Design an enzyme around this catalytic site. Structure first.
Site, PDB file in Angstrom:
ATOM      1  N   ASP A 182       0.843  -1.202   0.000  1.00 27.85           N
ATOM      2  CA  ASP A 182       0.000   0.000   0.000  1.00 27.85           C
ATOM      3  C   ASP A 182       0.871   1.242   0.000  1.00 27.85           C
ATOM      4  O   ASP A 182       2.056   1.143   0.260  1.00 27.85           O
ATOM      5  CB  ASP A 182      -0.905   0.015   1.236  1.00 27.85           C
ATOM      6  CG  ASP A 182      -2.267   0.621   0.974  1.00 27.85           C
ATOM      7  OD1 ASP A 182      -2.472   1.260  -0.081  1.00 27.85           O
ATOM      8  OD2 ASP A 182      -3.148   0.436   1.832  1.00 27.85           O
ATOM      9  N   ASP A 228     -10.701   3.093  -2.839  1.00 26.79           N
ATOM     10  CA  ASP A 228     -11.032   1.805  -2.228  1.00 26.79           C
ATOM     11  C   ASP A 228     -12.510   1.445  -2.418  1.00 26.79           C
ATOM     12  O   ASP A 228     -13.390   2.255  -2.128  1.00 26.79           O
ATOM     13  CB  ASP A 228     -10.698   1.817  -0.728  1.00 26.79           C
ATOM     14  CG  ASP A 228      -9.186   1.792  -0.441  1.00 26.79           C
ATOM     15  OD1 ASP A 228      -8.358   1.818  -1.373  1.00 26.79           O
ATOM     16  OD2 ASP A 228      -8.821   1.750   0.752  1.00 26.79           O
TER      17      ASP A 228
END
Ligand SMILES: *[C@@H]1O[C@H](CO)[C@@H](O[C@@H]2O[C@H](CO)[C@@H](O[C@@H]3O[C@H](CO)[C@@H](O)[C@H](O[C@H]4O[C@H](CO)[C@@H](O)[C@H](O)[C@@H]4O)[C@@H]3O)[C@H](O)[C@H]2NC(C)=O)[C@H](O[C@@H]2O[C@@H](C)[C@@H](O)[C@@H](O)[C@@H]2O)[C@H]1NC(C)=O
Ligand SMILES: *[C@@H]1O[C@H](CO)[C@@H](O[C@@H]2O[C@H](CO)[C@@H](O[C@@H]3O[C@H](CO)[C@@H](O)[C@H](O[C@H]4O[C@H](CO)[C@@H](O)[C@H](O)[C@@H]4O)[C@@H]3O)[C@H](O)[C@H]2NC(C)=O)[C@H](O)[C@H]1NC(C)=O
Ligand SMILES: *[C@@H]1O[C@H](CO)[C@@H](O[C@@H]2O[C@H](CO)[C@@H](O[C@@H]3O[C@H](CO)[C@@H](O)[C@H](O[C@H]4O[C@H](CO)[C@@H](O)[C@H](O)[C@@H]4O)[C@@H]3O)[C@H](O)[C@H]2NC(C)=O)[C@H](O)[C@H]1NC(C)=O
Ligand SMILES: *[C@@H]1O[C@H](CO)[C@@H](O[C@@H]2O[C@H](CO)[C@@H](O[C@@H]3O[C@H](CO)[C@@H](O)[C@H](O)[C@@H]3O)[C@H](O)[C@H]2NC(C)=O)[C@H](O)[C@H]1NC(C)=O
Ligand SMILES: *[C@@H]1O[C@H](CO)[C@@H](O)[C@H](O)[C@H]1NC(C)=O
Ligand SMILES: *[C@@H]1O[C@H](CO)[C@@H](O)[C@H](O)[C@H]1NC(C)=O
Lengths: 391, 390
Positions: free
Chosen positions: B139, B200
């Site tokens: 990430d 997301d």
């Protein structure tokens, strides 16, 4: 409206959301707006338990009319789609023990573009009465001023009254004022059995959210004015259709009961899943909606993506709804002091709590000083009924 | 990334969307992020057919780490929630025939706030390979500049390589870049097996629409760069959870096949409906996603609240998806000239068309000049496979 009708929120079925303005009976004969569609629904309303559950109005929305008025200035049913006419339809619907609703518009055209009733309020009133119409949904499209809008809604009310027939009068009046002027619901209630406040529902969770958020934002203004014979209409149930998840369907059924909304299904009764049938025919939840006291619920609190709504019922009972607005993750824990519910008094000295939705389950006795813990699904709702021990 | 992996898009299970960062094993022991949670999922992946359908990567997202590195500067599994460590979890997962994915961050902290790998790329890479990891999701939170982002992503790619273990490398690189610069997908493809392009996903129709809408808008930038060893990642499958109607779930499965997306379930395999399981394990739809040609599909046209997407497949076949974006009313009829499909070669001279979603059905043969008519549910999708007759 003091006409003896809608003493509890009206229940029934309306074609619009599911079937809209489908005039093509060549290609889509089983879904176009025709007499056959409504005869079929009326048959199913009896045979599949909808009438028994209390759904009794079978209601035509827009797009039933022929394009032109007749020589005597009357609205005509479309002749190829309703070849036997509205009278015969009304008689057929009446022969099943059901009631017939119909659609018209305060202004020059209906939203779909068919003849509006401006300039024909009395004639249209008389026509419906003679046909045996039991309810009129009266829309606010193509109306040039708000003065003309009010006058029209009032004129049609008085017109309906002068016929001498009992007809439930559903208005869209305050919806077409918003946000240009402040509705006076005391005035509106004098003339209407219910009133749409807000934008058209569709088959979406965005839509349901937007209706709930609008209602809670405006509850201080519209909650007190509702009661027997005059209700807030947040528009149709879209349960059993396509665009809501099961949890979102429950949220709608729970919150429509909390809100003392009229319950107009818009779906295909010929093709509805047993689960959606079960939810819409839920006796306990309908009983909440149909509470004789007719006190509309409200949002008690919001925070942390939770919402708590509550409605005061008869027999010293309360319905309480907890919504999880987080649209990610899993079931979420919510805990509330029962002393915060029911303005302090629901559970003084104690109350018995039953979960109705998403499943029915007895929870037990809760003393004034104690706390309630629930797990609420994302976009879902837990519906609880609180029964005070003072009886 | 030329490491031999992800020749077709990666399939597996990923905890994040459904279980998130639940550290409370006191009150919620069956849903907190713990070793038991992954062991159960692993047992079910085998027993409930997921592995056989193709889902092989079991992946821990964020919130598996202790708050501090150990005295040798290594990341550590939380001692309360992973008392037996990640090595023993990997061995357990491996023993079931599955593969373990794990999570780290290129910056100074993870998005949940646990230790990031900046300054520790080589050590962390070595740790993971020694542990027996087979996939890394990396990430991009808490990075201070775009150069450190790009450098970091690049360094970790090399580090994993230097270990000599096969490790699928998933980057959120372009997602974190997009607000400030257009990414270089040629660069990103060099270092990554997949890359998250966008915000997301969550358990909502809005979310899914917005991913498709973003992907279609930017399709000239991202479609052709994808292929074996390097994919666009529109994020997790969320079929079987709470926020989506059955029609919306079919839309996700369909478009994730058309887009040649990695298929990462994020759901509770212990509590999943038969209908959701059947969709997620649909062999013919998976087969489209896993087509060895590995050419990503694209939106062909939009209009009148309809979208048509198509994807080219090996064996002169095509997959076509028609989406009804009107969120009111009933099933809506859509008519398309098959000559419009497959750059005009799909049904030249003719094709046999099978419907796969929402229900499998053969529709017969179609000449190049013929027209196809379907009824599509609101927010739903019809998915077809076209076989050329040559
Ligand atoms: C929303 O709409 C409603 C319905 O119209 C209003 O309620 C009405 O308000 C009027 C005030 O104009 C009241 O009229 C009074 O009625 C009583 C009978 O009980 C009379 O005593 C009184 O007569 C005096 O004043 C008149 C002045 O023209 C003269 O006719 C007489 O000679 C005499 O001097 C007067 O006619 C209605 O009774 C009332 N109806 C109802 C159903 O309540 C709303 O008005 C507000 O809310 C009311 C409850 C009251 O509090 C009013 O003072 C408020 O202004 C109106 N809301 C708003 C925001 O305007
Ligand atoms: C046209 O408009 C007129 C004028 O408003 C309207 O007249 C009203 O009709 C209602 C309903 O029939 C009357 O209300 C009744 O009042 C009597 C006492 O006077 C009561 O016996 C009735 O009780 C019933 O409803 C109660 C509700 O609390 C229940 O407790 C009970 O179970 C009864 O069923 C009821 O309260 C009202 O009095 C008249 N008003 C006037 C001024 O005449 C008429 O109905 C309208 N016509 C049409 C067709 O719309
Ligand atoms: C670290 O990085 C190096 C450099 O990128 C990387 O080495 C590369 O590995 C791949 C795959 O192992 C090699 O590509 C292969 O080349 C051989 C020989 O020509 C072929 O046998 C292979 O073809 C088969 O598999 C292909 C899939 O990749 C299929 O296309 C085909 O159908 C065959 O079945 C394949 O093309 C590549 O040669 C090297 N690159 C270099 C520069 O040497 C190494 O794997 C990485 N190490 C780790 C641990 O990640
Ligand atoms: C994670 O946090 C650390 C700790 O703050 C970051 O390291 C620091 O980064 C800053 C800014 O990039 C560096 O400042 C630089 O100083 C030089 C002078 O030596 C100056 O010329 C530059 O203009 C700049 O201001 C700082 O040196 C550096 N400190 C340490 C402890 O190394 C790091 O960048 C962060 N990493 C990420 C990816 O966010
Ligand atoms: C309808 O149309 C006429 C003339 O076009 C206009 O004067 C009238 O006010 C309109 N009525 C309404 C209520 O919009
Ligand atoms: C993108 O990266 C490649 C490889 O480093 C490089 O050759 C090329 O110049 C870059 N192109 C762009 C889009 O700037």
């Amino acid at each position: 409206l003091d006409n003896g009708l809608a003493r509890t929120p009206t229940m029934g079925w309306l074609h619009w959301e599911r079937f809209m303005c489908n005039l093509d009976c060549q290609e889509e004969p089983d879904s176009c707006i025709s007499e056959k569609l409504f005869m079929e629904m009326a048959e199913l309303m009896v045979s599949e338990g909808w009438k028994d559950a209390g759904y009794e109005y079978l209601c035509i929305d827009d797009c039933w009319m022929a394009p032109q008025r007749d020589s005597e200035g009357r609205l005509q049913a479309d002749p190829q789609r309703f070849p036997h006419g509205i009278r015969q339809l009304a008689n057929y619907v009446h022969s099943k023990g059901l009631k017939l609703g119909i659609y018209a518009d305060v202004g020059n055209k209906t939203c779909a573009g068919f003849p509006g009733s401006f300039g024909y309020y009395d004639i249209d009133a008389q026509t419906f009465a003679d046909w045996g119409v039991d309810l009129l949904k009266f829309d606010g499209c193509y109306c040039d001023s708000l003065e003309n809008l009010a006058d029209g809604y009032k004129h049609m009310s008085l017109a309906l009254n002068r016929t001498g027939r009992s007809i439930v009068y559903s208005c869209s009046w305050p919806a077409y004022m918003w946000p240009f002027q402040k509705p006076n619901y005391t005035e509106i209630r004098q003339y209407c059995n219910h009133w749409r406040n807000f934008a058209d529902i569709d088959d979406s969770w965005k839509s349901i959210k937007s209706i709930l958020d609008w209602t809670s934002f405006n509850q201080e203004r519209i909650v007190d004015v509702a009661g027997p014979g005059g209700w807030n209409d947040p528009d149709m149930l879209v349960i059993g259709n396509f665009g809501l998840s099961w949890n979102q369907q429950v949220t709608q059924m729970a919150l429509w009961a909390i809100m003392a909304a009229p319950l107009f299904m818009s779906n295909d009764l010929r093709h509805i899943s047993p689960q959606a049938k079960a939810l819409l025919q839920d006796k306990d939840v309908i009983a909440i909606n149909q509470d004789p006291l007719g006190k509309q619920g409200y949002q008690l609190r919001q925070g942390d993506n939770f919402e708590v709504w509550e409605r005061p019922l008869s027999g010293l009972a309360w319905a309480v709804a907890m919504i999880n607005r987080q649209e990610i993750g899993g079931p979420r824990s919510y805990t509330i002091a029962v002393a915060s519910l029911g303005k302090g008094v629901a559970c003084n000295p104690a109350c018995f709590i039953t979960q109705l939705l998403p499943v029915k389950r007895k929870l037990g006795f809760y003393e004034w000083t104690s706390r309630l813990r629930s797990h609420i699904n994302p976009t879902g709702t837990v519906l609880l009924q609180l029964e005070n021990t003072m009886q």
